[PDB]
Ligand binder design. Structure first.
Ligand SMILES: O=C(O)Cc1c[nH]c2ccc(Br)cc12
Ligand SMILES: [Ca+2]
Ligand SMILES: [Ca+2]
Lengths: 440, 420
């Protein structure tokens, strides 16, 4: 719809704002609405960003916004409120009468919190008195990377002294002094570094804490992020990423696993973006292509339901309503319509052990509810967990429960113990798979 | 790029992002011998002359024929136009990769990669077609939403479903409500009503083209596609998945209505998957086809596919070239008579099927099942002797399996070593 900030209408509308993010989607835009006399909520996926906007508004313009994050909450009364999706979700969502305008910044984000948070805004904002929701991103669905004036991009050839994802890095260009290199996994961040900390070029691997630079060559996963020492002269990109996916493996039910894929445009623009910051920069790549942005995996829907039940006190049917509003809204990332299936499985998961759930939550496991629940049925059948990986630590108490086969609900990682596939909850999920997933 | 690249002085690869004959004639006026490649040379509408019809400086052929001809012959062309270069069928990908690898050595000075739908393309509005979201209100349940009887009672309508089974079930529900509903899917008669009267065609993505009326299209916005699973049981599985449709698919389904007269498009999902990626099973297909059809050693197939993957502006895929090249290299001594048979039957992976049958016949062991795929072995009696030496899964497996054939172990090792 808009490449500029949409005016406030007289009846509720959902507007799309597609703008370069240097143009202050998170600063200039909410400030313009504020100057007009509106109360504006600004949502972002990351805690750092949210605090980072608050600071900039206090320092560069003397405006002290409300800040709302899990770790810290500041209330000044300013018409501008900065919050994370997660904190917005924990706050219970849209507070009646609070906001005239809600900006969903980085609306391209496909982590579970962002999707459930935006779904919630689209379900609730009109009823709560907002006149206008703005879905703001620099990279709408279908976006590909465009050229950058102060970054020249050069294909790697197979000629060179370092083996790199089927191609070669000529020894020179990483002796310029100032370099970031992206590898898909941890295991090959060491192996790649060590294949030249032993060669002496001086290199360190990131995935822990920070350890770098004013020379140096950093090789890291995506666990480093967009800021820090923006001075690099070149980036070298393997152009692939590790993503979470669900397999309906029927063994007995589903598996959450990881796949290595070609990077999408969001990934490529961002990795390339850590050079050419003022200076001229060079981008070197294994592969010229990229998936367009705008698709996400059904395993992320699973996560939304997991967080609904674990963090936000949402019955699955309520999470479905929020996600349904997301899925019905045009110009947002798309996924398989598996709402019925996941509402289905989580609704069958009754009488979870509160102590286990309040152990997996603190642990930072990805699916605290699913984990605590498998552990729940394990304890009550006096069976062992599916393995003695760290995920299952809430059960340390091998001793009574080592009685036999694990009653396996689903696969969240590697399964080491022998299993039994006949538990009523397992049969229940299988029936939900028949009921709610299509065939052929 | 929107306009036809002027012929340069050295060899290069250009991209023509043209919207929905055009350009080739222009290059032919200038003395240039041009070759134009498509998936098919049949009339794009389903009616009219073939593209190869003579009236020459311009040849019209297909990627399939081009590959069978052995690719680029001599200095026979200055300009090669790869049209519909967004196509991700195996023949198109191997065909384009062949052009890119051979064109310059064959003395061509320009390769045009033309498509109306570059990577990242999204479906755009149609001046002539009104689009309306289905609600959950209506008599006919449809992929989680509902079709109201009112919008298909009377008139002519096309409903897309993702499978044969869904088409039968939906048509039966319509007929029971008094609608003249007809199921269409491959294997059928174009018995879609002859005429002009009310009809609701319930169809898969068979039926292309055609000649229907259709005041409206209703779209499930779902597709079925082929995927490889690296399932370690023992090795990999070729399977079929349902995914959200991509922009190509939505545009094409919506384009059955609003031809001339205004039309109405009704949908289950507002969004599509952006176009521009394909599965690793397609790579596997390319090597299979290289070995069965085109007499290509796996390393020759790799060379062509690598050229494709180094070329910007084309659909992307996982880099499994070394993996697939490695498994086909191990597949030695295939039974020739079996390969002939799976080639004639139109199996999707004739080399892989025949090779599994070759391993069965030698161990005098039965096929993984007695589905039609395995009928080269049908001289059955001596062979049912025990477990199946299972190399990979190309379908459902009914027989008892054994996982210790050396070729199974070989492929497992390729998986360990070539797949991260
Ligand atoms: O920590 C944040 O502010 C974001 C967030 C992500 N997930 C959350 C769950 C609860 C609460 Br409170 C907050 C979050
Ligand atoms: Ca699978
Ligand atoms: Ca699998």
């Amino acid at each position: 719809d808009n490449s500029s900030p949409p005016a406030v209408p007289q009846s509720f509308q959902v507007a799309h704002l597609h703008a370069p993010t240097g143009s202050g989607k998170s600063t200039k835009v909410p400030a313009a609405y504020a100057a007009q006399g509106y109360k504006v909520l600004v949502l972002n996926p990351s805690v750092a960003a949210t605090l980072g906007f608050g600071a900039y508004m206090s320092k560069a313009h003397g405006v002290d916004p409300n800040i709302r994050t899990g770790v810290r909450t500041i209330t000044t009364g300013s018409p501008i409120t900065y919050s994370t999706y997660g904190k917005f979700l924990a706050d219970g969502g849209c507070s009646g009468g609070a906001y005239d305008i809600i900006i969903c910044d980085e609306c391209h984000s496909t982590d579970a919190t962002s999707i459930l948070g935006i779904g919630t805004v689209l379900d609730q904002a009109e009823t709560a008195g907002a006149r206008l929701v703005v879905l703001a991103t620099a990279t709408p669905p279908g976006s590909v990377t465009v050229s950058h004036p102060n970054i020249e991009e050069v294909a790697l050839s197979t000629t060179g002294e370092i083996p790199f994802y089927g191609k070669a890095i000529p020894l020179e260009v990483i002796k310029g002094g100032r370099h970031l290199i992206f590898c898909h996994s941890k295991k090959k961040c060491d192996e790649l570094a060590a294949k030249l900390v032993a060669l002496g070029i001086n290199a360190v691997a990131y995935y822990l804490d920070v350890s770098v630079i004013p020379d140096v060559v950093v090789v890291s996963t995506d666990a480093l992020m967009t800021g820090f020492t923006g001075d690099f002269d070149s980036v070298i990109d393997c152009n692939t990423c590790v993503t979470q996916t669900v397999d309906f493996s029927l063994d007995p039910t589903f598996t959450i696993e990881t796949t290595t894929l070609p990077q999408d445009a969001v990934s490529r623009t961002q990795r390339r973006g850590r050079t050419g910051r003022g200076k001229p920069g060079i981008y070197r790549f294994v592969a010229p292509g990229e998936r367009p942005s705008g698709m996400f995996d059904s395993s992320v829907l699973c996560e939304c339901y997991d967080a609904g039940c674990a963090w936000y006190e949402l019955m699955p049917a309520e999470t479905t309503v929020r996600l349904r509003a997301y899925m019905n809204t045009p110009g947002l990332p798309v996924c398989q319509d598996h709402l019925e299936f996941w509402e289905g499985v989580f609704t069958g998961l009754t009488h979870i052990d509160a102590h286990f759930l309040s152990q997996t939550k603190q642990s930072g496991e990805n699916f605290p509810y699913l984990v605590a629940y498998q552990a729940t049925v394990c304890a009550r059948a006096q069976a062992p967990p599916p393995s003695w990986d760290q995920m299952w630590k809430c059960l340390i108490r091998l001793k009574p429960t080592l009685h036999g086969p694990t009653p396996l609900l689903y696969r969240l990682g590697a399964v080491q113990n022998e299993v039994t596939l006949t538990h009523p909850i397992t049969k229940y999920i299988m029936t939900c798979m028949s009921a709610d997933l299509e065939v052929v």
